[model samples]
Target: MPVAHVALPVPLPRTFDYLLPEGMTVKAGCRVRVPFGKQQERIGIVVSVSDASELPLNELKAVVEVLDSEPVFTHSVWRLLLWAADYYHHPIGDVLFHALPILLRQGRPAANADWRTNYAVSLRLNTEQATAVGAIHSAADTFSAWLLAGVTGSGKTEVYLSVLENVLAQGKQALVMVPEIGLTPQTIARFRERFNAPVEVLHSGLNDSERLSAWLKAKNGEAAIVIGTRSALFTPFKNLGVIVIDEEHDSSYKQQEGWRYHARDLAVYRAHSEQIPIILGSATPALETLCNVQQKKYRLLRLTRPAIQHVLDLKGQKVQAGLAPALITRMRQHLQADNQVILFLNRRGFAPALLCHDCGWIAECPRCDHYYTLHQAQHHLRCHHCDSQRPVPRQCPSCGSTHLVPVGLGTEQLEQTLAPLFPGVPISRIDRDTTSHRGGARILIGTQMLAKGHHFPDVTLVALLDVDGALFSADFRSAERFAQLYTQVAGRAGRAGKQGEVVLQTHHPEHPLLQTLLYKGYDAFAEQALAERRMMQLPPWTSHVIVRAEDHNNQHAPLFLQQLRNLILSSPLADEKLWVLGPVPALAPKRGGRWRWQILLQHPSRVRLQHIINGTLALINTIPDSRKVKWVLDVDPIE
Candidate 1:
């Protein structure tokens, strides 16, 4: 009897072997049902088959059934999945199953279903756009990485569609990965309209059956273009031509749980393996990406000018409720001209904090080390970090005074202020709470949601309500994020013929980051940021891994990490290149009744770091105290 090595979805680090029945045949990448533990059965993927088994044939249980007549993953995809599991140091079973749709993981057949399919006409490209598209298409036969560094409103999507047109014409498939789900519908619309082929979208918003249908279409070469969020990177393309990562700098591309893999990074690997072209388009590229460009590892494509003229500057002006008076005047000007105005404030609540005027007591979340935001509409105080909520008090809890007032500004407060400032202008708020329909108002007030791939040709004025919070932050990555946001928000202004203006409301108008951004653009800012990162020996310069632990008992969390850190320090693996820091509390030290702690591991070589981590993890599993705390290892952690 033959034996099959099956990968089941469990936390274990290795695969299990099951005896194959006398006649049943199964291939690698096909699903199999087998007995797991004590009368329990599990659905697993057949990884490999051999004629001889290491285990005794009498002890091995036979496979219950073969779920598929064919393999679910192609040879290339199967190789990619295995590489991901090895690179991420995650279980092969979990990585393989997590890549599939819920329906397929549950043993449902992949079948075509009713899906939205609409075709539209493609737009002619500008000279600069055509050149970029030609460059990408010229390299379609080989592996290449191109950075499409275009300013906002510079027609990056037009370039994408042009290259895609060539890719589809070659009778191959293309995959476009966006940073967020909000961009899926818009991206799908653009891709569908450009070509007369099936365009499938994969996102968390789709049901299991719909996702399976889309995945099946991609695998069968029935879908020419697939547009989706991070998880869509795993979709099998029959003849993949090009891979496009839109807004590649956005942190949403990194998965925070389980297998913590970055899709953008994986896409590059996939493109290289498949001998295809991969394009990373962003108005503001990340520091690591720019570093790659500086090293000449990626070809640089530039779209220096916007389709419309836009003036952007920081104003050292007085602000009322986070809005500058000059910005207000600009809003009025745009509205009077029958154009739209976009007011951007990253914060979303009515007020960041409730303060008592008498004693200066402020409201804070009891569960987390953060302030409680006051939601006026809901009449509740909510912790943005922990999701803890309570009713707004009539009086300050700390001080027996009824003179409580809102301290800081947010989207709700800005909406209220703008409505009164620009009367009868029809203001539409676009945030997590009010993003259900298409906003057609003259004035749009929103959070970061509006800074993404939203197209508003009528909007000519864009204002950043506040930049102070982002300017001074403990996290080094915050500045990079702020620059990206500023550039993206500024890109939201202007139209075909009319010029636009972006006003930045900041007291520190002369800040180095802002000055560099306004005067030299994102490239210069990125150079300066990368220089600083090198000096600090941070990421892209050095690799980092965080071992985070949490427990209801505060001491256990720190103790477990401290033990782990000591174990690493005392081991022979410790070297000059490997540095260990912390056993320190996380930014939000406590949340949801648990205390959090972490240990930071820095190494110049990622391979060496992973090798040490692999050994350390094995040692940790043997420790008796390990079971007392819940922990995770985050590689290249964003936060």
Candidate 2:
């Protein structure tokens, strides 16, 4: 009897062999049902077919049934998953299972009969957009990486449409990735409007059936273009000609939890493996991407002119409620002119903290090492980090004083203040709370959610309030994120050929970063930021991996990580060209009642880093302390 090597959806690092029944046949990437551990049955993917196994034939269990007549993944996609498993040092079972839709994982058939009709019309491209499209289309024959560094409203989408048109015309599929689910509707609308082909969408909002339908369409080449969030990178294509990552610099492309893979990076690897052209489009490219451009690893396509002009500077101005008086005046002018205004504040609650004037005491989260935000509408003090909430107190907990006031402003407070400032104007708040329904109000007040590719044609003025905290952040990536935020939020204004104006209100308005952004531009700021990163020996100059552990007992978390560090130090490669930092508390030392600690490993070579991590992880599994805490290996950690 033959045996099949099955990859079960468990956290194990190896595959299991199952005895094939009489005259049974199975191939790689096919789904099979098998008995696992005692008597429970589970669905697994057949990784390989073998005539013999290390286990005795009498000891092996037989496969219960074969679910698929054909393979679930194409050869190239299977290869990509294999590479991802090895490179990310993750279990192959989890990596493979994570790629499938929930329904497919449950042994359901991967077939969709009702394919939507194509209703799209092509649009003419401008000179720069035309040049970019020409360049990408010309390179469609081979593998290449292009950086589409276009300003906001610079018709990057038009360029994408043109390139995708060519790819579809050649009977090939294309993958378009955006950072957020909010952008999917508009992106699908735009892509559907431009190309007369089935444009499928993949996002968190999709149910099991919808996701399975989209996945089936992409796998069988029924869908020409697939637009989605990070997980869409795994969608198999019959003939993938091009891959475009819109807002490529957004950290949302990096999955923070299980697997911790960067989709943009994986897209590069996939494109290279498939010999297809991949384009990374962003207004403010990540420093790492810019470094790649500087090294000539990626071809640069620039869009110099914005669709609308804007004045963006705040030199010496009075401020109120974290908003500059000048910005308020501009808002009034735009509103009076029958246009809309947008206010951008990254914080979402009513206030960050409630402080007692006399005692200097402030409300804080008991579980987290952070302040509790006051949600006035909810009449509660909520910890943003842990989602813990309590009733708002009338008096100071320490001094017995009643003069407790909100110190810092957030989106909710901004909306409250702005509603009174512009009495007659319709205000729409676009944070996670107010965005449940589609918004079309005249005045928009929001957090980072507003910056995620939202179009506000009626908005001519944008004010970024309380951005001083981002200017001097402890994290090295903060400056780069702030630059991206500034560019993206500013981009939201001045669409539809209407003149737009942006006012950045910060205490350190003259800070070098702000000055560089306002006076020079994102490219200049990116250049300077990359240089600073190089000077600091940060990422793009070196590789990083963080071994993070969390536990209810603070001592246990640190002790577990320390044991792992000691094991690494005892290894043969400990003295090599690698640096280890910490076993220290994370930025949020206490979160969700768990004490978090992390150890960072840096190496000049990613290959060497992976080797070190693999060795360290293997040894860690033997340490009993490892079982006491929840741990994660975050490669190329963004936060």
Candidate 3:
């Protein structure tokens, strides 16, 4: 009897073997159904086909059914999975299964509706755009990494479309990666309106069948244009041409969870591996990329003049508004123009803190030692870190006075204020609050979702409210985060060839950071920021890892972290290159009745850093109390 190896969608490290029926032709990447354990039938991906079975001939169960007429993933995708598993130190089976669409993982048939495609191509390109396009097309015969550092509205998309058109003209497929799923519709629209061939979309929102269909289309050369999110890189293309990463500096390019891979990095790696051209386009490039440019590893392609003044230079400027006045004025002007305004309040909930008037007592999460936010909509104070909530108090618990109020404003409060300020102007607040429903975010507003990438062409002004909290933080990376947020929110303005304005409200109008950013722009800010980071020995110069632990009892959490800290300091892993610090209460120490503590790991070499990480994991798992706490390791954590 022949044995078949199957990869099930479980957290196991190994694949299961099933007896293959006579005259069956199954290969790796094909889906199959077989008896799991105790007569339970499960659908799994076939990992291998063989002639011998380890199980007794009489006991071996025959393969129930073959799910696909062809292999779902190509051999290249298989290699990508193997690479992910090795780099991220994840179980091979889990990595492979996790990469599959949810429906496919659940054994549903991979069908055609999994993907929606649109096609469009460029009719013509201007001189600058044409030059860039020609360069990429010419480099297809060799490996190259090009940075498309075009300014906002400088026809970067046109350049991308033109290059893609050339690739499609040659009957090859192009993979374009954007930062967010929301950008997919707009990008697809542009591609569809330009080219005559089908353009497939790969995003998190797609169903398993949709993803499978897109993968198959690209693999079979049916999809001339593949525009998708980061994971799209894994999709196999028979005639692969150009790989474009929009907003290359986006942290979203980095997978925060399992596999811990960076999509942009992978794009470069894949481009080099396949000897093709990869374009990384960003108005504000990451300092790491800047360093690459400085080292001559990447060629800088600059296009700094915006198509129009769609984006106002809000650098080095502070909001003159005493709280909300500046935002109110700008928003009022936008409304006066009979246009809508986008109020980007990154913080969710009503108030970030509830304070006592007398002694300055603040509401904090009891369990996690973190601040509990006030969510007026829910009529409860909540913890953002933990989903703990409580009813609003009539009086301050510490002072016994009826003076308790929300300390800071959030998305909810901003929405509340905007309602009356812009009476008839459809004030759509895009944040975690509005996204509570299935399509609440998309439905309430126009077709765009407000969280990140959806472009609001009608938005004349964008107001970033209360970002001071990030500025005052002690974290070395706060400035970089602030810059990224500013860039993203600012980018939302002036999209689609429209003139736009952005107002960042802050009290410290004269802050040097603000001044540098305003006077010098993102590039100047990056130069100074890089200097600061180098001085501080932070990321790009040194790798960092954050190990966080939470426990029901606050003392236990700190005690455990302390134990780890002491062990790390005493271990051979401790060196000049490796620095171990903290066991300190995190930014939000208590949340939902749990105490949280964090330890920071720093090293120049990722290889040595991971080795130390493994040792730390081993130490934690062996500890008696480790199981009593909830812990996570965030490698290269953005937050």
Candidate 4:
């Protein structure tokens, strides 16, 4: 009996077996249509060919049909995909199918089977950039990881293009991963302008068919340069020469929901397995990456900081609508100079700030020095960072004002606030025009969109409205993100050579993190933050796996998690080695009618942590009441 092992699109951890019909031949990594249940069938990739006569042959069902004669993924990709499934704790079946686009998953024939297609110029590289480019090119023959840490406007784009050209020179393909935001256009256009030829881009801008088309082209060697967001890691390459991941520290690189895998981590594995070098490019590299460099696991390459970038202290200063007087005056100075000023505010228009209408006193978090989000449903103010909750006070905590208000000073608010100060000045968070067109908005207010590498030619001042939000966060990674944001925001200063300045308004002027970033640079801030993490037993010092459980009624959410924690403690997996902390409520415990609770699983070694998590999951289903709640395991959770 020929029993073939197939990886179906199911949530289970293992593969299923199906019988092969007479005179039928199948190979590993090829897709096959197989019976899933009594009344259903599914298309899945065959993991391996098997034979078993120990069972009754009549009990087996034949393969419905084979989808492809050859494997969809190349040798290295196949290995990486399977590794990702096992590593991320996602089902091998779902992981296998996810590698292909929706059209391909349905067994649709790949479009444009024949590979006959095209497509840049290089900038004069600075000495450091030239060194960075040559360093990667010299190691093109072997497997290695390079950390491309450069200050904003440090000619990193030139280094990237030069390295990419070197990879193309070897007659192989390259892939570039960027953040998922409006920032994609700037990245795409920059590459498009310099490459001077066709570039396959995978982002939200394209439809499914278009994405599938790009996928096919990239796999067939027609698209030599493939650029995309996080999900584009799945894009198959015939001969992947090198990979450049821009903004390596961006949280957008992590997939937060089901099948949660960090694209950069998987890309690193892929490059190593492919025997090709990879470049993790960022203005501020993640602390984990810096730790890897310290351990001699990855090579560190630096680019010298160029001219044109500032921070403003707001200690005891009168801060109005999230802007200091000096900042407002500076805004006026730049607006008067006929240069655009873009302000970066990282949050949204929803999260609230509980404040007193008369006194202007805000109900900030006691533990964390940030605004507490007003929970209308609960009639309380909740700390978004530390999850601390306090009742709405009868009067202002600072000035005894009776009536209170909740304000969200986001893009919408900033746009309106600046209107009266800069009369007749265009103020908005939307739309842009060339410098020649002075009719456009002069002072722009935005979120992360303003911080990304978009060109604001006439912009002289790039301001950040609030620096306190990123300084002290419950999640230890917040400082790194703040560092990255500050660097990125500062990079936008003085595009047209008017001596651009970046003014970050923060109440804590003497904060060590900002001081390092202000006096020294991102590297100094990272070094200090890394030392803090090492002392706190946080990430880069330890690995983490979060187990989440939720139910609408709230009872089962924590109850179910509590039982699971007991299971972990009772089982061999615990052994007093793994730190299991929580059955506690989530940061935003209630969302969309469900109450969520989670448990933290931590260990010093990733391998040991992986083993513990593997054992914990194996024992997960043993809890009969677990079905009452929706439970999920998040590995390397960002929040």
Ranking by TM-score: 4, 2, 1, 3
Question: What C-alpha lDDT values do all the predictions have?
Answer: 0.77, 0.77, 0.68, 0.76
Where in model 1 is the C-alpha error above 4 Å?
51-57, 110-127, 182-187, 203-205, 306-429, 433-466, 496-501, 570-572
Model 4 TM-score, 2 decimals: 0.84
TM-score of every model versus the real structure: 0.79, 0.80, 0.73, 0.84
Give residue 340's lDDT in candidate 4 (0 to 100). 85
When summed lDDT is taken over every stretch of 10 residues in candidate 4, the lowest stretch is: 113-122
Q: List model 2 lDDT by residue over 574-631, tens digit each.
A: 6576778777667556668998888888887898788777787777667898888998
In model 4, the clashing pairs are 120-195
> For candidate 1, lDDT tens digit of each residue in 1-639?
789999999987788999988789999999999999898999999999998677887889999999888899877678888987876778889999999888878877756541213433345677888889999978999999999998877889888888887887788889998877446456567666668888887766788778888888888888888888898888988889999999888888999989999999889988998999999998888887888888898999989673232233333334455565666676777778888777766453223456565555667778864566665667887664455778988987776778765543556445677567777878776655545334444887766645365567777777765464455333457568778777765555544456767777654567787789878877888898899899878987899888889999899988888899888776677798888876766655667999887888899888888878877777876566888998887888887
lDDT of 4 by residue, 1-639 (tens): 578888888888887778988888889988888888778988888898878734576777889898788777778878998888777788998888877888878877667442223322344677888888888988997899999887767877788888887777667889888887534666678777666445787877687789888988887887878988888887888888999888888777898877888998988998899899989987778999999999898999998753244566654456666677888888888778777887776465345556565544667788866567776667887765456779988888787767665544456455676677778987666433223234544877656534364566777777776465555334456567667767665655544445778887765567888899877888888899899889878888888888888898989878888888887776565555577887767755777988877888888888777776678678777888778888888888887
Name the weakest run of 10 consecutive residues (lDDT summed) in model 3: 439-448
Q: Could you tell me the lDDT of residue 461 within candidate 4?
A: 77
Which model, 1 or 3, shows the larger lDDT? 1
Q: Of the candidates numbered 2 and 4, which has the greater lDDT value?
A: 2
